[PDB]
Amino acid sequence: SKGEELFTGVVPILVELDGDVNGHKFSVSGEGEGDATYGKLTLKFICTTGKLPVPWPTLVTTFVQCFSRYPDHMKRHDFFKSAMPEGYVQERTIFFKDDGNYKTRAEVKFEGDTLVNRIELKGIDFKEDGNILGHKLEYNCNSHNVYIMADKQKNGIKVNFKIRHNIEDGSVQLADHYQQNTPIGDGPVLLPDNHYLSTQSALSKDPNEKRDHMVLLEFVTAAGIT
């Protein structure tokens, strides 16, 4: 795989998002690096427009699966790296149970030696006093399985998973994710057999940062094929 070679070392990452949730407009810029050899991501995000109008955890999945660690025996199933450097379009609808939904369109590609994730996010039908606009979600992330299947129809993949956000009262806010990825370039890509990615994420704060922000440490490994 041509794209695979671009990830053998540490790669700088830039994330830029413009969002509008129930008319609340905001922007976020993130910076960090990824080391796919260890399925590792380290990033810091800053809301550049002021206060983030939704809870930071709800944006984690939106903020580069090309950094997932694919075991050597599963290398032929790594769609994400195969689309590089030209990149891929990643689209999602995220349904927050008993609340609104986010629709996102992103382009993930290299700009020079930097992997960039540019995203537009639109959220509608949120409840003013719900868990999202009401900021009732804990500042943490549970671990999940991300299910991947080929989508020959579009020379891409279809992805689905259920994120469970912890609510401060002890309950859980489900966020059902439906995702599609298609290559931007014309080069061939790897269409995978069914498998999944196992994720884990840790959120923290920079003690010296006064802007609204999020520090993220994440590990992701592909699995499901012997």
Curated annotation (Swiss-Prot):
Changing F63L: In EGFP; increases fluorescence at warmer temperatures such as 37 degrees Celsius. In EBFP; gives rise to variants with blue fluorescence. InterPro entries: GFP, GFP-related, Green_fluorescent_prot. Changing K75R: In Topaz; shifts the major emission and exitation peak up to 20 nm. Green fluorescent protein has been engineered to produce a vast number of variously colored mutants, fusion proteins, and biosensors. Further generation of mutants led to more stable proteins (at 37 degrees Celsius for example) with brighter fluorescence and longer fluorescence lifetimes. GO terms for biological process: bioluminescence; generation of precursor metabolites and energy. Changing F95S: In alphaGFP/cycle 3 GFP; improves folding at 37 degrees Celsius, reduces aggregation at high concentrations, and increases the diffusibility of the protein inside cells. The keyword NAD does not apply. Contains a chromophore consisting of modified amino acid residues. Maturation of the chromophore requires nothing other than molecular oxygen. Changing I167V: In EBFP1.2; shifts the excitation and emission spectra to shorter wavelengths and increases quantum yields compared to BFP. Keywords: Chromophore, Luminescence, Photoprotein. It comes from the Eukaryota. It holds the Pfam family GFP. Changing D151V: In EBFP2.0; shifts the excitation and emission spectra to shorter wavelengths and increases quantum yields compared to BFP. Energy-transfer acceptor. Its role is to transduce the blue chemiluminescence of the protein aequorin into green fluorescent light by energy transfer. Fluoresces in vivo upon receiving energy from the Ca(2+)-activated photoprotein aequorin. Monomer. This is Green fluorescent protein. It comes from Aequorea victoria (Water jellyfish).
